[PDB]
Every structure is written in C-alpha cells, then in structure tokens.
C-alpha cells in the first residue's frame, strides 16, 4: 500500500500536471511530445527540483501504463561503463519495441557519475541511432559531462521551486492528510527549504509526528523550529541580545547555557547570527566589514577544529568590537 | 536538423581556424604526400579529429573508403584487434598513387591498453611504407614512449579570441542570424577556447531566443551572470553589492565556486580601476577561492571577500 511509503515517495508526481514550479520547461516538453518533435533532453538542476519525476511522468504520458517495459532507465546504482554502453545501450537503440510500435526512450538518470570513456562512446550512439530512440540525461553538475555530449542534447535548467508552487504542493498535502498549518508556520517552512520539496515533505511528516495529538490542533512555528532542528530563532535572538546589550560574563554564560542545553553547534549559531544581522540597518559600513571578516575567519577556523569555548568567546568579542564602532 | 557543429564541420584544411603552424604543415603534407606517423594531442573541442579527417580525405581522394581504417574508443581496440584487424589492413594490398599511403586513424588513443600499444610498435614499423598511423588523443603522456618515438608530435593549443570570433562571424553570415557585439563577447567568454562548445552555445541561444544577446546568453546558458558579477564588484556601497549578490546570484541558484571564479575572471579582465587595487582584489578573491576549495564555501565567505575588496577600495 502507498500508506507505508514516506511522504517524499508517496507524493511522487505520476502525471505532468502534478509537477509544480517548472512551467516554461513542462509546457515546452508537452508541446514537443504532442507535435512529435522530441529532441534529446538534458535536465540540469539541483537535487529535489523534480527532474526524475518529470521524466517519469513524461514517459508515462508517452507510452502509457506499460512505461516500465518500453523505457531503458539507467542510473548510478547500475553499472554504467563503456562495455555496458556498447552492449546494452546499442542493442536497445538498434532494436525495436517488444510491446508496441514507436520510438524508444533511454533515461540516463544521474549521468554525471559516468566515465569519460562511456560518454565518448555514447556521444556517437546518440548521433547514429536518432530516428528510432531518444536520450534523456539528468544532471546536477554540468561540469562532469563532456562538451561533446553536452552539445548533442537540448538543455533544460530546472529552477528552484518558487513560493507559489511550493505553497500549492503544501496545500495539496494538507488536503491529502488530516493536518492544519499556520500561515507564519508555512512561511517559516518555505524559508528553510531553498526550493527543495524533499526537505519540505520530510519535515512536514516529522512535525505531524511531533504533534502528539489526534491532529485536532494546528502546526505553528514552534513545532517546525523545535522539530526541523537547528538553533531555534528564540534562542538565536536571545543569544544575540545578550551579546549586544548584556555584560561580557553574562553573555558568555548565556551562550554556554544555550549551546549546552540543547547541544547546539557553534557553526549553526554563527550562521544564524549572520542571517539575522543581515537585516540590521547599520551605520558606516566599517562595522559590517569588521563583522563579516571576523565571522568568516572564525567560521574557517571552526571548519578545522579547535577549542569551542575560545571560538565562542571570539565570536562574542568580534560582534561586540564590530558594534562598538556604531556610536 | 543537423547541429551546426556537424553541419558546418570543416571538410577542407583551409576552413580550420586552429593553430596556423600545424594547419599549414598538414596542408603542405597533403599537397606533397608522404604523410608520416603522427600523434595529435590537445584539449577537447579545438579541431583535432576534424584536422586528421580533413588530412586523410584530401590525401586519399576517392580512395578514402578503402584506404582509411577508422577506429574510435567506441570500438574494441584491444590486443586481439591490433593483432588481427589492424595487421590485416596494414598487410592488405592496394594500388595507390605514388605519393599516398593507407591511413589508420585511431581516435582517443589515450584509452588503448598497454598490450595493444606495445603490439602496435612492430605493426607500424614493418608496414611503414604502405600504412601510416595517425593518433588523436588529449593526453600524450598516456601513450607509451616507444610509440611516440616512431611518430611526429603535434600539440594543439587553445583557440584565441580572434579565431573563434572569426569562425562565429562566418557561421552567422552563413546562417543569417541577428546578433550583437556583447552577445558574441559573452559567447566567447563562456566558451573558454572551446570552439565546439562555442558553436553549440550559439546554436542553442539561436534556437531558444533568436537574438544572440549577452542577456539571452547569460540566460539560456545562465551560469554566474558575469555582467552581474562586474556590477556587483563595481558597486560603490557595501549594501548594494550585498543585495546584488543575494538576489541576482545566490537566490537564483548560482554556486559559490562559479561566483568566485567568474569573480576572478571579471577582475583580471577589469580596466576601470588601477593595477594595484586590481591585484589586491584578486588577492582577496584568490584567498576566498582557496577557502571554498576546502569545502568552506558559503555566503559568509563571499560577503567577507566583498567587504575586504571594499576596504581595499576604501583607501
């Protein structure tokens, strides 16, 4: 049953109408398939944008419910070498379908992990067998693909999911599940996503599990912040306030108790304070220069280890000395 | 329709805008004959396979079909193939003009195994009067020294801005495309001496927008927004540069590596500011790039780089 799959897998789009966010490429692909001229596709984009779902729904719309038999889907999990190409891909392209009549589809998912020799052998397979089969290459990094292979396919860049589409998908999930979501909670959820539907679905399932109730209540910002993890905005602003206004020893004690009560990390607090202070309308940019320089130096030092207490005191002193120029 | 890289693939050695010295060398060789064993090395997309194809075609005339043996990396090129098929082709009898020879083209020679490369030595040595070998590779170090000792070495270099610009102008004239100077400049900038990639990006921009303009090129082939990077670096106030970096580059999915590397290029090629301030900005950009290469690539590092650049510009 589908009620056992996680929310990332349960809500996988099955038709091209369930793929939100991508409109300029989805409409163009639909037109390509309806009019017949479907060229070799290269779906390039970040993880969680919906490239695999898009190509799966496309193959479903093209071949019907028997997609799993008329399409050759290869990925990084399968052995993709030069001999694998030579045998499997060439035998698939040269032959015809065993279930119906029509062009074939080879979905090379995650083809950014293929060997250079494999791509050099495949670039002439794409150019030779081009009247009975097509090629779809999915990629997250366009630098791992040879320029020869990169030039034979039409490139489609999957942009990160915008606010409207991600809110539409959130509303669809809240309709499918007996769940309610607060508006500010929804905004905070969209903020910590960066256009990644996987993260949204995962944390939505997790906060539904956090509810502890039969779901007669709503999901507020507190639930998301306590469940999604990472220094809560409350503790973040409390530490920032104690650093900016309170005394040195009191600020040290506050930072220590905050980072030791929930086991928070100093790097997460650093990034959070950087994100919060970005909205601060400040005086002459010298304070911002000092703050950014010292915080980046402390982050680079943390990225290699050291004393957490010394680095926390360094963060406190850096923020304080940077703000002392604003007077 | 056929892509412009394949449709406008050069068929005569004069159409190649590559390295002039080696091109005239191969042209004189095809004119006089007596083609020796050769190994052409370089980088992808500079006219290596097309060069040897044009040389073989011009040298063999109509006998190209029965006098040229093409073996790519897509075909088996092991010890057994070199032992049987290459030797049978080299021993094959063929009546040719008194200035021509049978040509064995081996594309991607850097992928052949050590056994095949070792067996090819005497194969090319005993039949060096009726069979000639032309290797096309990207790394000459992958081919054993005994094989390199029996052949000429042609190292192809990157294509300068002028040659790629001339080839693109010829293609535009042959295709009647609407373009502009800044668009072609952005195309050549994103090509990085890669003629094949340049023609591919040009054709993609044409088929996607019709007009070859820098905005479209930085849109259909969007990667780091150079002009946007230049406007970010040339900002007068820190908040403006920070907002540009946040909205235009970071909120649109541009990776930090692309931002810093595009940043380095913009600076190196900058002319608005003096030399010393440019060197200091490159030094800051360089340190930021070093930090990112270690996996510390975030928005805070780029913000600190911009802050240090502004502090340098702050007299």
């Amino acid at each position: 049953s589908k009620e056992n799959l996680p929310w990332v897998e349960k809500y996988r789009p099955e038709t091209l109408d369930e793929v939100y966010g991508q409109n300029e490429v989805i409409t163009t692909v639909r037109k390509f398939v309806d009019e017949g001229k479907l060229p070799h596709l290269l779906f390039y984009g970040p993880p969680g944008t919906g490239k695999t779902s898009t190509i799966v729904a496309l193959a479903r719309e093209i071949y019907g419910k028997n997609y799993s038999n008329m399409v050759l889907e290869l990925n990084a999990s399968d052995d993709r070498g030069i001999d694998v190409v030579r045998n499997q891909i060439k035998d698939f392209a040269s032959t015809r379908q065993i279930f119906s009549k029509g062009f074939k589809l080879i979905i090379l998912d995650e083809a950014d992990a293929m060997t250079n020799a494999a791509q050099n052998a495949l670039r002439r397979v794409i150019e030779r067998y081009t009247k009975n089969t097509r090629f779809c290459v999915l990629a997250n990094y366009a630098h791992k693909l040879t320029p020869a292979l990169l030039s034979r396919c039409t490139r489609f860049r999957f942009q990160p999911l915008p606010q409207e589409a991600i809110e539409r998908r959130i509303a669809n999930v809240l309709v499918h599940e007996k769940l309610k979501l607060s508006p500010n909670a929804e905004k905070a959820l969209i903020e910590l996503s960066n256009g990644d539907m996987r993260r949204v679905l995962n944390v939505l399932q997790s906060c539904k599990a956090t509810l502890d109730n039969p779901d007669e209540d709503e999901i507020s910002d507190d639930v998301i912040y306590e469940c999604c993890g990472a220094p809560r905005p409350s503790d973040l602003k409390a530490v920032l306030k104690s650093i900016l206004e309170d005394d040195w020893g009191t600020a040290h004690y506050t930072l220590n108790k905050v980072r030791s009560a929930k086991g928070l990390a100093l790097i997460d607090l650093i990034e959070g304070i950087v994100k919060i202070l970005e909205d601060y309308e400040l005086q002459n940019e010298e304070t911002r220069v000092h703050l950014l320089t010292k915080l980046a130096d402390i982050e680079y030092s943390i990225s290699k280890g050291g004393n957490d207490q010394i680095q926390g005191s360094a963060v406190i002193g850096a923020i304080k000395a940077s703000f002392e120029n604003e007077t | 329709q056929l892509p412009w890289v394949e449709k406008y693939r050069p068929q005569v050695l004069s159409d190649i805008v590559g390295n002039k010295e080696t091109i005239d060398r191969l042209q004189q060789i095809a004119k006089d004959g007596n083609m020796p064993h050769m190994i052409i090395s370089g980088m992808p997309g500079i006219g290596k396979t097309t060069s040897v194809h044009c040389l073989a075609h011009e040298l063999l005339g109509r006998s190209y079909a029965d006098g040229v043996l093409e073996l790519n990396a897509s075909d088996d090129r092991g010890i057994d193939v070199v032992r049987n098929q290459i030797k049978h082709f080299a021993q094959k009898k063929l009546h040719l003009p008194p200035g021509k020879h049978k040509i064995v083209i081996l594309d991607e020679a850097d992928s052949m195994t050590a056994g095949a490369q070792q067996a090819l030595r005497r194969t090319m040595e005993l039949y060096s009067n009726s069979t000639r070998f032309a290797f096309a590779c990207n790394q000459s170090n992958k081919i054993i020294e005994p094989l390199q000792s029996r052949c000429a070495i042609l190292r192809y270099s990157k294509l300068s801005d002028e040659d790629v610009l001339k080839r693109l102008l010829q293609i535009i004239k042959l295709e009647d495309v609407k373009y502009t100077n800044d668009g072609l400049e952005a195309i050549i900038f994103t090509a990085e001496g890669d003629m094949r990639q340049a023609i591919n990006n040009l054709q993609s921009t044409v088929a996607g927008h019709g007009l070859v303009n820098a905005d479209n090129v930085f849109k259909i082939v969007d990667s780091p927004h150079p002009l946007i990077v230049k406007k970010m670096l040339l900002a007068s106030n820190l908040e403006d540069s920070i907002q540009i970096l946040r909205t235009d580059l970071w909120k649109k999915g541009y990776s930090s590596i692309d931002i810093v590397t595009t940043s380095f290029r913009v600076t190196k090629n900058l002319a608005q500011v003096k030399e010393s301030v440019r060197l200091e900005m490159i030094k800051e950009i360089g340190l930021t790039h070093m930090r990112i290469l270690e996996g510390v690539g975030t928005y805070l590092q780029l913000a600190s780089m911009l802050a240090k650049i502004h502090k340098l510009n702050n007299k």
Binding site: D91, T95, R96, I98, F99, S100, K101 | -
Partner: protein
C-alpha cells in the same frame, strides 16, 4: 478453438526445451493446418520458429484459429508433468485468457490439469527464411553439439567457414585457438551419420557461442540438423519433426 492432443507429452516437452532459456515470450497460433510458434530473444539476434502439422497429433480439431502468447518460463515450469508417456492435450477457447494443459494416464486414474495465464503480444510473425542460401549442410546433431561444445570453451565467437567439400568450425581466444574440420561423406552402413554439403558459394560467418549453445538443444528432437548459411541473412539451423520442424535463425556477428 485450440484442441491438440499429443500421443506422448514428451514430444511437446522437448519442443519447449528448445525455446527454453534463450527466449522469454512465445507466440503460438493454432489453425487448420497445424500449430506454429515464434519467439525472439531480447537482443533480436535469435528467432525460434516452430511448425507442427496436423498429423503429428493423435487428435486435432480447429474450426477457428487462436493466437496466444505466453511466458516460456511459466510453460516449462508446468512442462515436467507429462511423465513423457502421459497423453497431453492443449485446450483453449477462441478468446482465451488462459491455456489449459491436460495430462492424463491411459486409465482414468490420474489427471493433471493446468490453466496457464496468457500474455498479450502484438501478433507480428516474421517470415525471414530465404529461397536460396549460399551453402547448405546437414550432419548428425550430436556431432554438431560436440563441435559447438568443444569450441565454446575457447571463445565467445565460433566461425563457420565453407569451401568446396570442406566445412570448418573455428574458435580463437585467450588460451589459444581450436578448429574442427569435417568433410562430406555418405555412409551406407547407416546414412543418418552421413555429412552432406551443397555449396553454391563459399561462406564464412561468425556467431556468438552463447547462441549456438542454445541452438544445439534441438538434438533431442532429431538425429540430424540442417544448417543453411548466407552472407545476406540470418543462418538457419533446422531440426525436423514427424510432420513439422523446429527452426533457429541466428544473425551472424557483424
């Protein structure tokens, strides 16, 4: 409808043994003059084609052709109940969702009946057999099996070369090379051991050893095997049945 009764379930079991392993799906079609069946492997280099005339059966009735496709593996799984001596009757209506295999012993005693689920396969029987082949030869099938089994060990490719009065099988690989040379000859002491050869043109073709190995299975259906080769088409290896034949068409290696 389909109604075909084999005297001995064994004949059908050996026939299916021939499709076994090398193909997954088989398309059968019964009609007024008998039963035919075709199966093509995934790579499309091998076609297995069967023909069983009305006379090969103890009872055959057909007033309306029926085409039915099925999974070969499922069929063989069920094809070991024939006791070989059991009687086998294939039964199906005009628009079947299944094929019934009915095995019965002489006496009323034991009746094993199966209802095999069918697969829908687009009817598209191939007719790739040639009028004339470059060369034609027949020899004992056990001999052909040995020849194939020898050479197979040496390479994944076995070459068949034919010149006037000479047939030569060759394999050459890592450990070395091997060859089996046979010459045409009429043995009156029993002509089922003779080796005939009619050559209109010398031929020299290479085949994948894995496929020739699949093909040799036909030895169990006939004493002799006919091999027809051409430079223009797939080679034909044929095993005759009483009223019928099992044919294997194999595309030469390019």
């Amino acid at each position: 409808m389909l109604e075909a009764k084999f005297e001995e379930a064994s004949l059908f079991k050996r026939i299916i043994d021939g499709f076994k392993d090398c193909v997954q799906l088989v398309n059968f079609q019964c009609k007024e003059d008998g039963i035919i069946a075709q199966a093509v492997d995934d790579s499309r280099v091998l076609l297995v084609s069967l023909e069983i005339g009305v006379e090969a059966f103890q009872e055959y009735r057909c007033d309306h052709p029926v085409t039915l496709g099925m999974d070969l593996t499922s069929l063989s799984k069920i094809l070991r109940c024939g006791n070989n001596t059991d009687t086998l009757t294939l039964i199906a209506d005009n628009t079947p969702d299944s094929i019934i295999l009915l095995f019965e012993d002489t006496k009323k005693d034991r009746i094993a009946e199966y209802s095999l689920k069918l697969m829908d396969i687009d009817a598209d029987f191939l007719k790739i057999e040639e009028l004339q082949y470059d060369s034609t030869l027949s020899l004992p099938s056990s001999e052909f099996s040995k020849i194939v089994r020898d050479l197979s060990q040496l390479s994944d490719s076995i070459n068949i070369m034919i010149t006037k009065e000479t047939i030569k099988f060759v394999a050459d690989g890592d450990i070395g090379s091997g060859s089996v040379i046979i010459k045409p000859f009429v043995d009156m002491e029993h002509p089922e051991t003779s080796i005939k050869l009619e050559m209109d043109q010398p031929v020299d073709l290479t085949f994948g050893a894995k496929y020739l190995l699949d093909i040799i299975k036909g030895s169990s259906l006939s004493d002799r095997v006919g091999i027809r080769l051409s430079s223009e088409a797939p080679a034909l290896f044929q095993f005759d049945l009483k009223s019928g034949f099992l044919q294997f068409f194999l595309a030469p290696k390019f």
